[PDB]
Design an enzyme around this catalytic site. Structure first.
Site, PDB file in Angstrom:
ATOM      1  N   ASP B 147      -4.834   9.926  19.297  1.00  0.00           N
ATOM      2  CA  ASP B 147      -5.712   9.559  18.025  1.00  0.00           C
ATOM      3  C   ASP B 147      -4.605  10.536  16.446  1.00  0.00           C
ATOM      4  OD1 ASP B 147      -8.402   8.780  17.581  1.00  0.00           O
ATOM      5  OD2 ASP B 147      -8.754  10.719  18.016  1.00  0.00           O
ATOM      6  N   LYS B 149      -3.788   9.628  12.970  1.00  0.00           N
ATOM      7  CA  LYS B 149      -4.531   9.382  12.154  1.00  0.00           C
ATOM      8  C   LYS B 149      -4.887  10.665  11.126  1.00  0.00           C
ATOM      9  CE  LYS B 149      -9.330   9.696  13.617  1.00  0.00           C
ATOM     10  NZ  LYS B 149     -10.682   8.897  13.985  1.00  0.00           N
ATOM     11  N   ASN B 152      -7.598  13.914  11.600  1.00  0.00           N
ATOM     12  CA  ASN B 152      -7.135  14.279  12.133  1.00  0.00           C
ATOM     13  C   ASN B 152      -5.946  15.273  12.111  1.00  0.00           C
ATOM     14  OD1 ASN B 152      -8.643  14.186  14.872  1.00  0.00           O
ATOM     15  ND2 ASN B 152      -7.779  12.621  15.318  1.00  0.00           N
ATOM     16  N   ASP B 165      -7.046  18.990  17.066  1.00  0.00           N
ATOM     17  CA  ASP B 165      -8.755  18.891  18.189  1.00  0.00           C
ATOM     18  C   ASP B 165      -7.166  17.423  19.251  1.00  0.00           C
ATOM     19  OD1 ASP B 165     -10.044  19.158  16.675  1.00  0.00           O
ATOM     20  OD2 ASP B 165     -11.256  17.836  16.307  1.00  0.00           O
ATOM     21  N   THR B 182      -8.144   5.356  17.464  1.00  0.00           N
ATOM     22  CA  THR B 182      -9.009   4.142  16.484  1.00  0.00           C
ATOM     23  C   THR B 182      -8.587   3.060  16.676  1.00  0.00           C
ATOM     24  OG1 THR B 182      -9.408   6.975  15.771  1.00  0.00           O
ATOM     25  CG2 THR B 182      -9.287   5.287  13.914  1.00  0.00           C
TER      26      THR B 182
HETATM   27  F1  LIG Z   1     -18.378  20.475  17.241  1.00  0.00           F
HETATM   28  C1  LIG Z   1     -18.076  19.518  17.477  1.00  0.00           C
HETATM   29  C2  LIG Z   1     -17.918  18.822  17.761  1.00  0.00           C
HETATM   30  C3  LIG Z   1     -18.119  17.420  18.032  1.00  0.00           C
HETATM   31  C4  LIG Z   1     -17.463  16.521  16.769  1.00  0.00           C
HETATM   32  C5  LIG Z   1     -17.125  17.509  15.124  1.00  0.00           C
HETATM   33  C6  LIG Z   1     -16.660  16.533  14.437  1.00  0.00           C
HETATM   34  N1  LIG Z   1     -16.856  17.898  13.405  1.00  0.00           N
HETATM   35  C7  LIG Z   1     -15.629  18.583  13.628  1.00  0.00           C
HETATM   36  N2  LIG Z   1     -14.617  18.771  14.291  1.00  0.00           N
HETATM   37  C8  LIG Z   1     -13.667  19.803  13.549  1.00  0.00           C
HETATM   38  C9  LIG Z   1     -12.320  19.844  13.955  1.00  0.00           C
HETATM   39  C10 LIG Z   1     -11.640  21.048  13.007  1.00  0.00           C
HETATM   40  C11 LIG Z   1     -12.240  21.735  12.062  1.00  0.00           C
HETATM   41  C12 LIG Z   1     -11.238  23.264  11.305  1.00  0.00           C
HETATM   42  C13 LIG Z   1     -10.579  23.773  11.997  1.00  0.00           C
HETATM   43  C14 LIG Z   1      -9.469  24.327  11.478  1.00  0.00           C
HETATM   44  N3  LIG Z   1      -9.722  25.197  10.969  1.00  0.00           N
HETATM   45  C15 LIG Z   1     -10.991  24.031   9.651  1.00  0.00           C
HETATM   46  C16 LIG Z   1     -11.637  23.056   9.874  1.00  0.00           C
HETATM   47  C17 LIG Z   1     -13.663  21.753  11.628  1.00  0.00           C
HETATM   48  C18 LIG Z   1     -14.136  20.329  11.960  1.00  0.00           C
HETATM   49  S1  LIG Z   1     -15.677  18.775  11.607  1.00  0.00           S
HETATM   50  C19 LIG Z   1     -17.892  18.916  15.800  1.00  0.00           C
END
Ligand SMILES: Fc1cccc(CNc2nc3ccc(-c4ccncc4)cc3s2)c1
EC number: 2.7.11.11
Lengths: 18, 307
Positions: B147, B149, B152, B165, B182
């Site tokens: 994944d 991109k 990420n 992720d 993607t």
């Molecule tokens: F809980 C969820 C379940 C499914 C999808 C998502 C998608 N949204 C997001 N995913 C993330 C991942 C990492 C960070 C992050 C990590 C470390 N330092 C700063 C930011 C932020 C975000 S906001 C969230």
């Protein structure tokens, strides 16, 4: 131009996984 | 000493992979998703800030994300690399799953790239070298990323990349068949419904390098199905500002033919590390982060027993 084609595609924002 | 580093890294990995750490702690919003949210938290005893992913166990089960969730946490707690996020704590309670990781304040490479337009080739190369090393690390552990991109890739306070992720990552030695990733970043063999291997991550690197240096990806269209058609044709056009070294590297990464794709040949990752586009890259200094960055910013108890 290729840049104008990119903007026209509507795929300039965050892309989701399929 | 790369061989010695990778053999010790695999020893360190397998131990943690075979006996994962569980329940290492107890209970602003930075983002949200379908089965949870990410919050900026403060560890009370130290005053240290972290990003906490909160996953609703019920919503994970409903959306068929059990295996992906168990697997992602399992990888996160077992890996150790400078460009992979450090998981500090993980725990669960009656309702949720929690993953407390390093807070990466710089945000996504995606935002910086759309704002700036495109990155200069040295700038694109600084990030590309970090991805090369990360995939070399992951692939040695039999981990396919799947994944890659800009969305990420987080940029830290030192301007270096952080991967948080692993929702589509899979530990597999040979072939795998899942249609995932993607559309813009899909290798032709994933689209063509055949078995594929770690070489799909090297195709994705080609797409990433092209997008960072051009400001747009090599294959785009209004709909994913039209993007798949361009990818499988493999007809790539390069902007006139792309250097000769870049076009050649990209021709070898964005190779439809697996017996010709860079990273998938007998010399492996070394065909990429020894490419002319990377002649000025100090691979050991990139690893050590000594290179100055060009940019500085009870519910479902049975299902989550292993978490
Ligand atoms: F809980 C969820 C379940 C499914 C999808 C998502 C998608 N949204 C997001 N995913 C993330 C991942 C990492 C960070 C992050 C990590 C470390 N330092 C700063 C930011 C932020 C975000 S906001 C969230």
């Amino acid at each position: 131009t290729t840049y104008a084609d990119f903007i026209a595609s509507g795929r300039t924002g965050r892309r989701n996984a399929i | 000493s790369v061989k010695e580093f990778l053999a010790k890294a695999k020893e360190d990995f397998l131990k943690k992979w075979e006996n994962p750490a569980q329940n290492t702690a107890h209970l602003k919003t930075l983002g949200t998703g379908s089965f949870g949210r990410v919050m900026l938290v403060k560890h009370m005893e130290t005053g240290n800030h972290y990003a906490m992913k909160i996953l609703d166990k019920q919503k994970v089960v409903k959306l068929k994300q059990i295996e992906h969730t168990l697997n992602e946490k399992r990888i996160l707690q077992a890996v150790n690399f400078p460009f992979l996020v450090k998981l500090e704590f993980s725990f669960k309670d009656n309702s949720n799953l929690y993953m407390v990781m390093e807070y990466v304040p710089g945000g996504e490479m995606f935002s910086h790239l759309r704002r700036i337009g495109r990155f200069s080739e040295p700038h694109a190369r600084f990030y590309a070298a970090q991805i090369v090393l990360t995939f070399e690390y992951l692939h040695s552990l039999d981990l396919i990323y799947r994944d890659l991109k800009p969305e990420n890739l987080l940029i830290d306070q030192q301007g270096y990349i952080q991967v948080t992720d692993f929702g589509f990552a899979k530990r597999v030695k040979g072939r795998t068949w899942t249609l995932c990733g993607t559309p813009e970043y899909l290798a032709p063999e994933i689209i063509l419904s055949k078995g594929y291997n770690k070489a799909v991550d090297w195709w994705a690197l080609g797409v990433l390098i092209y997008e960072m240096a051009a400001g747009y990806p090599p294959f785009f269209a209004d709909q994913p199905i039209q993007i798949y058609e361009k990818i499988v044709s493999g007809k790539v056009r390069f902007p006139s500002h792309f250097s000769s070294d870049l076009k050649d590297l990209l021709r070898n990464l964005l190779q439809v033919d697996l017996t010709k794709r860079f990273g998938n040949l007998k010399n492996g990752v070394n065909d990429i590390k020894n490419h002319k586009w990377f002649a000025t890259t100090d691979w050991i200094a990139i690893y050590q982060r000594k290179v100055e960055a060009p940019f500085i910013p009870e519910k479902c108890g049975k299902e989550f027993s292993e978490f």
